[PDB]
């Protein structure tokens, strides 16, 4: 039996898929802790590792495999279902088994993706400080027509302070916040002026290391929902530029409240791709 995470119906991804658009021919790269490529519910086409001692196709953490599942868990009779199950999946390992990585390793990942013709880049990661090299790698991938999506951060609320991390904070990157199955913002979801859109990030069920599925909380689970949506929109309107895809996302977002806590609102892929 194949389970369908509340995340996909909530963003209306099920309606677009029903139309026949599943992200086919779109190249999405997940910049994470890698992916357990042997997982029966995932199809990794390629990737690269910029972390010493670890190949791109193994996930000794779980984070990468789970984020990858949210974007493209195969549409079969088992496991879960991704937002864009027909996407071309690339695993770019920029974080080690402990979920950490260096600026250089990440910059190399961003660069590799841009150079290898990735259409969408997912970065479920963030740090308190940015780097000018990271800022250029991102501004360029975006300028080169690549859709860059990043988790906004799990620093939650803290008085009236900006808790958005990098690279989510850079203009060429879409900062994704998290909400639960009731569309209520999750208390851990970072807040700040740079917040752009919200997506299911609380209790999301997805693929997990050694042929299984688990549930996790975090803006990291939210980001892959927006990356899968970008891929859906593109599988329908191949001619759109990254800038246009991104605008359709924030323009057709279901208003939830102040932009500081929700951005433009919960994404609606049916409205964005129409
Ligand atoms: Ca499946």
Curated annotation (Swiss-Prot):
GO terms for cellular component: extracellular space. It catalyses: Hydrolysis of proteins with broad specificity for peptide bonds, and a preference for a large uncharged residue in P1. Hydrolyzes peptide amides. It is found in: Secreted. Inhibited by p-chlorophenyl and 1-naphthyl boronic acid derivatives. Binds 2 calcium ions per subunit. Its cofactor is Ca(2+). The active site is at 32 (charge relay system), 63 (charge relay system), 220 (charge relay system). Its EC number is 3.4.21.62. Coiled coil: none annotated. Residues 5-273 form the Peptidase S8 domain. It comes from the Bacteria. GO terms for molecular function: metal ion binding; serine-type endopeptidase activity. Ca(2+) 2 binds at residues 168, 170, 173. GO terms for biological process: proteolysis. Keywords: Calcium, Hydrolase, Metal-binding, Protease, Secreted, Serine protease, Signal, Zymogen. The keyword Protease applies. Ca(2+) 1 binds at residues 2, 41, 74, 76, 78, 80. Subtilisin is an extracellular alkaline serine protease, it catalyzes the hydrolysis of proteins and peptide amides. Shows high specificity for aromatic and hydrophobic amino acids in the P1 substrate position. May play an important role in the degradation of feather keratin. Belongs to the peptidase S8 family. This is Subtilisin Carlsberg. It comes from Bacillus licheniformis. The chain holds residues 106 to 379 of 379 of the full protein.
């Amino acid at each position: 039996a194949q389970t369908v995470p509340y995340g996909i119906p909530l963003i209306k991804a099920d309606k677009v898929q029903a139309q026949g658009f599943k992200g086919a021919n779109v190249k999405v790269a997940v910049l994470d802790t890698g992916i357990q490529a042997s997982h029966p519910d995932l199809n990794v086409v390629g990737g690269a590792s910029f972390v010493a001692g670890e190949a791109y196709n193994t996930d000794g953490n779980g984070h990468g495999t789970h984020v990858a599942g949210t974007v493209a868990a195969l549409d079969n009779t088992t496991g879960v279902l991704g937002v864009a199950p027909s996407v071309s999946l690339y695993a770019v390992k920029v974080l080690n088994s402990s979920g950490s990585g260096s600026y250089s390793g990440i910059v190399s990942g961003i660069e590799w993706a841009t150079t290898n013709g990735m259409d969408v880049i997912n970065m479920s990661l963030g740090g308190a400080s940015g780097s000018t090299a990271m800022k250029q790698a991102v501004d360029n991938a975006y300028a080169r027509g690549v859709v860059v999506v990043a988790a906004a951060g799990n620093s939650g609320n803290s008085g009236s302070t900006n808790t958005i991390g990098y690279p989510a904070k850079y203009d060429s990157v879409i900062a994704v916040g998290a909400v639960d199955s009731n569309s209520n913002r999750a208390s851990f979801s970072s807040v700040g002026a740079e917040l752009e859109v919200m997506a299911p990030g609380a209790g999301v069920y997805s693929t997990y290391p050694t042929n299984t599925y688990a549930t996790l909380n975090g803006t990291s689970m939210a980001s892959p929902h927006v990356a899968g949506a970008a891929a859906l929109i593109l599988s329908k309107h191949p001619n759109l530029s990254a800038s246009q895809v991104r605008n359709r996302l924030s323009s057709t977002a279901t208003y939830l409240g102040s932009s500081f806590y929700y951005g433009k609102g919960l994404i609606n892929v049916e409205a964005a791709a129409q």
